[PDB]
Structure 1
């Protein structure tokens, strides 16, 4: 889900989400390495893969 801070106008006009992401760079590079591995293993082992029908 990733709930996140926000900052909204009292009129409900605009809702700025107010955060800079800030990841620790070894754990971030290793998380992307983790799902590079897992996502190769899912494209290898899906019987046929369909995307989204994009709008």
Structure 2
């Protein structure tokens, strides 16, 4: 209440085949986008 610390109080539950299919979809999309772009601008670090 004084604003000291803020715990995210939630556990991330996933279905396992649904999560496997989500990562496979975004795997295929990231491969297609790396092929499709000629110039990929990886951002600079640290961002601020």
TM-score (norm 2): 0.90
- C-alpha RMSD of the superposition: 0.6
Correspondence 1:43 to 2:34: yes
Shift of residue 40, structure 1, vs aligned partner: 0.3
**Alignment map for 1:1-55 (pairs within 5 Å):** 10-55=1-46
Size of the alignment, in residue pairs? 46
**Deviation beyond 6 Å, 4+ runs, structure 1:** none
Q: Give the structure with the higher percent strand.
A: 1
Structure with higher RCO (Cα < 8 A, 6+ apart): 1
Q: Give the structure with the higher percent helix.
A: 2
